[PDB]
Structures are given as structure tokens and as C-alpha cells.
């Protein structure tokens, strides 16, 4: 897949190359720092919601590992030769992110369903439809990106199909959020709508990143895409995870769980 991606087409200045390495490395640190926070804080979440914080830990590690791997793959792929970072071998590709999404997107959605107070059959069926829609979106996008170098029209049609799945997934998310807001405790009925908007914003960055080959096919475009994934990853995983956990603790306290109450009170 490395020859199928635009990164393989260029030599990089030291500035471009190092900035990309630094973005990815910084992303690793952010996710792992957040992982410690979610871990320590899970003790203050009621059993009914605790799986949500646990899912944030799994997401932080999954994301951090993939970012770590991307950083090593990048440094393995290029060597500074004759004044520029030049491709030495086929080690780098964005495909690994997509594969990872097959696991992370379902986790991110499930945590949302949990704090929404869905349970039993509704939880199971909603999770099923959502993950199918997510998988449809990710798989079609993965295929489309295989054509970013030699067939832009194909990247676009796979993108369109993928976008249909995204739109339908968003409809399910939005509908469940807006219809279940009233069940939310401790003022979280307000907070949860912000979570919806945050997802719409952050998730929308990925398709933009996906289209960079069509509109900025050059080395600075490669930098821009990595920058966009970095903003998106932190918003969709970390900020989103902190909001989910806040909602979970807040609901836990309102429901009578003492450790949550002590926690909010100690701060
Ligand atoms: C933690 C990672 C997340 C939240 C990834 C989200 C990815 C998307 C919403 C991807 C969407 C895409 C489209 C809607 C069309 C182009 C192909 C994709 C898969 C990038
Ligand atoms: C919401 C999460 C925020 C993510 C923070 C990302 C940190 C970097 C932000 C801006 C730095 C831009 C400077 C780019 C200089 C380009 C160097 C080059 O390519 O030659
Ligand atoms: C596609 C497969 C989707 C499996 C859905 C996972 C369900 C999450 C827990 C909900 C439950 O079992 O009640
Ligand atoms: C970049 C693409 C952005 C697309 C959609 C979402 C942006 C809106 C986020 C604002 C918060 C709105 C609110 O809280 O009511
Ligand atoms: C300017 C950049 C703004 C970035 C915002 C970052 C983190 C906020 C997320 C923490 C969760 C807050 C819980 C909601 C609440 O306090 O009501
Ligand atoms: Cl409980
Ligand atoms: Cl990921």
C-alpha cells in the first residue's frame, strides 16, 4: 500500500519530515497521558457506567499504539540523503489507521450508548446497526484510499459511498441522543448535545483529510493531512473521552454513587 499513497511520491525537507514525526510523537504522549487519567478516574464511576471509562482507556492505547507505529514506520521509510529525506523502503502507509478504526469507532460509539442510559435490547440493536454502518464506512474508505495516487475519480466514488454510510451513522447517533436526553441526570442532558456537535465537527475532519490528494497533492499536502488527523484524533478520542467521563461521573453522583460524589466534591 505504500506505493498507493501520495507520501511515497515525494522527498521531504528536514522541516517537513521532522514536523510530521513530532506530530505523531506528540499524539502518542497525549493519548498515553490521557490513559492514566481515565484509569485513575474509573474508580469514581458507578458500575452502570464504568464500561464507558474503560472504553476510553482501550481507545487511548489503541490510538497511541497506532500513532507510535506510524512514527516508527515513517522514520524507517526515509533517510536523509543528499539534502532531503528520500524514500528508502515501503514501510509507510495510512492504511493502518483505517484498520484501527474498525476497532476504535465501535468503542467510541459504545461509550456514548452507555452514558445515554440505553440498555438491554435497545443497546444491543443500536450498537449493531451503528457498527455495521461504521464498518461500511471504514471499509469503503479504505478501498478508496488505495487509489489516491493513480485514480482520483475512484477515490472520490468510494468516498461518496463511504459518506452515505457516515451520514446514516450520524443520523442514528443524533436521533438516539436527542430522543434520550431527557433520561440524563445531573444536568448532563445539556452536556450530551455538545458531545453530538463535537462528533460532527471532529469526525468530519477525516473525509477532509481523505480528500487532500485531490486538492493538494504535494509534500505540504502530506503535512496538512497529518495535521488534520492530529486535530481530529485528539478531538474525537481525547476531548470526546473526557466529556464522556465527565458525563459518566456526573450521572454517577446524581444516582447516589458515593465515590463519584466525593470525587466531584473534592474538586
Ligand atoms: C478515532 C477515529 C475516528 C473517530 C475516525 C473517524 C473516521 C471517519 C469519520 C472517516 C470517514 C470517512 C468518510 C466519511 C469518507 C472518506 C473515507 C473516510 C473513512 C475517511
Ligand atoms: C485540537 C488539537 C490541537 C493540535 C495541535 C497541533 C500542534 C501544531 C500546530 C500548529 C503548528 C503549525 C506550524 C507548521 C510549520 C510548518 C513547518 C514546515 O512544514 O516546514
Ligand atoms: C456487528 C456486531 C455487533 C455487536 C454489538 C455489541 C453489543 C454491545 C453490548 C450490548 C449488549 O449486548 O446488550
Ligand atoms: C469542519 C466541519 C464542521 C461540521 C460540523 C460541526 C461544527 C459545529 C460545532 C459547534 C457547537 C454547536 C453547539 O454546541 O450547539
Ligand atoms: C480553546 C480550546 C478548547 C478545548 C477544550 C478542551 C477540553 C474540555 C473537555 C473537558 C470536559 C469538560 C466537561 C464539561 C463541563 O465541564 O461542563
Ligand atoms: Cl450503577
Ligand atoms: Cl485510531
Instruction: For residue 78, give the H/E element and its range.
Output: strand 78-81
Q: Enumerate the domain spans of the chain.
A: 1-267
Q: Does residue 37's CB lie within 6 angstroms of at least one atom of ligand 5?
A: no
Using the Cα atoms of residue 110, residue 112, residue 114 and residue 117 in order, give the sign of their dihedral. Answer: negative
> What residues have their beta carbon closer than 5 A to ion ligand 6?
46-48
Closest by Cα among 101, 97, 53 to 259: 53
Cα–Cα distance, 219 to 15 (Å, whole number):
11
Residue 75 has φ and ψ, to the nearest 5°, of -65, -35
Residue nearest to atom 1 of ligand 4 (CA): 201
Q: Which of 189, 239, 240, 250 to mutate to test the pocket of ligand 5 (most atoms within 8 A of CB)?
A: 239
Reduced to 3 states (helix: H, G, I; strand: E, B; else coil), residue 202 is helix
Specify the ligand 4 atom closest to the Cα of 193.
14
Which residues pair with residue 80 across a beta bridge?
85
Provide φ and ψ at 137, rounded to 5°: -60, -45
How many angstroms is the resolution? Answer: 1.8
Tell me which residue has its CA closest to atom 2 in ligand 3.
128
Count other Cβ atoms within 10 Å, centred on residue 58: 15
What is the per-residue burial (b if ≥16 Cβ within 10 Å, else e) of 204-231?
ebbeebbbbbeeebebebbbbbbebbbe
C-alpha cell at 146: 488505495
Nearest by Cα to 236 from 60, 14, 12, 58? 60
CATH superfamily of 1-267: Rhodopsin 7-helix transmembrane proteins (1.20.1070.10)
- With H, G, I as helix, E, B as strand and everything else as coil, classify residue 189: helix
Which grid coordinates are listed for 263? 470525587
Gap between the Cα atoms of 20 and 216, Å rounded: 16
Q: Can you list the alpha helix ranges (DSSP code H) found in the chain? A: 14-41, 50-77, 95-115, 120-145, 152-180, 188-210, 212-215, 219-233, 240-254, 258-266
**CA angle, 253 then 182 then 48, to 5°:** 40
Q: How many Å lie between the centroid of ligand 2 and the Cα of residue 227?
A: 7
R_g over Cα of the chain:
20
- Indicate whether residue 246 lines ligand 5 (CB < 6 A): yes
Q: Rounded to whole angstroms, how far apart are CA atoms 154 and 24?
A: 29
From 154, 157, 162, select the one nearest 138 (Cα to Cα).
Answer: 162
User: Rounded to an integer, what distance in angstroms lies between the CA atom of residue 58 and that of residue 208?
Assistant: 26
Rounded Cα distance, 141 and 139, in Å: 5
Please enumerate in sequence order all residues whose Cβ is within 8 A of that of 14, keeping only pairs 6 or more positions apart, or say none.
80, 84, 85
**Structure determination method:** X-ray
Amino acid at each position: 500500500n505504500s506505493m498507493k499513497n501520495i507520501e511515497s511520491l515525494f522527498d521531504y525537507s528536514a522541516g517537513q519530515f521532522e514536523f510530521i514525526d513530532h506530530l505523531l510523537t506528540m499524539g502518542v504522549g497525549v493519548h498515553f497521558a490521557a490513559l492514566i487519567f481515565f484509569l485513575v478516574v474509573s474508580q469514581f464511576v458507578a458500575p452502570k457506567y464504568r464500561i464507558a471509562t474503560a472504553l476510553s482507556c482501550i481507545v487511548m492505547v489503541s490510538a497511541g499504539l497506532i500513532l507510535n507505529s506510524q512514527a516508527v514506520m515513517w522514520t524507517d521509510a526515509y533517510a536523509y540523503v543528499d539534502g532531503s529525506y528520500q524514500l528508502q523502503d515501503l514501510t509507510f502507509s495510512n492504511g493502518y489507521r483505517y484498520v484501527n478504526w474498525m476497532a476504535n469507532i465501535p468503542c467510541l460509539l459504545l461509550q456514548l450508548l452507555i452514558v445515554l442510559n440505553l440498555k438491554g435490547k435497545e443497546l444491543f440493536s443500536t450498537a449493531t446497526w451503528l457498527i455495521l454502518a461504521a464498518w461500511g464506512m471504514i471499509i469503503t474508505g479504505y478501498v478508496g484510499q488505495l487509489y489516491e495516487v493513480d485514480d482520483i475519480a475512484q477515490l472520490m466514488i468510494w468516498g461518496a459511498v463511504s459518506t452515505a454510510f457516515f451520514v446514516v451513522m450520524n443520523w442514528i447517533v443524533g436521533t438516539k441522543i436527542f430522543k434520550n436526553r431527557a433520561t440524563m441526570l445531573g444536568g448532563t442532558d445539556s452536556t450530551i448535545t455538545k458531545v453530538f456537535w463535537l462528533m460532527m465537527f471532529a469526525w468530519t475532519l477525516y473525509p477532509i483529510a481523505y480528500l487532500v490528494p485531490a486538492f493538494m497533492n504535494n509534500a505540504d499536502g502530506v503535512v496538512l493531512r497529518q495535521l488534520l488527523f492530529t486535530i481530529a484524533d485528539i478531538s474525537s478520542k481525547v476531548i470526546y473521552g473526557l466529556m464522556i467521563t465527565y458525563i459518566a461521573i456526573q450521572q454517577s453522583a446524581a444516582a447516589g454513587y458515593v465515590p463519584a460524589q466525593q470525587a466531584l466534591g473534592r474538586i
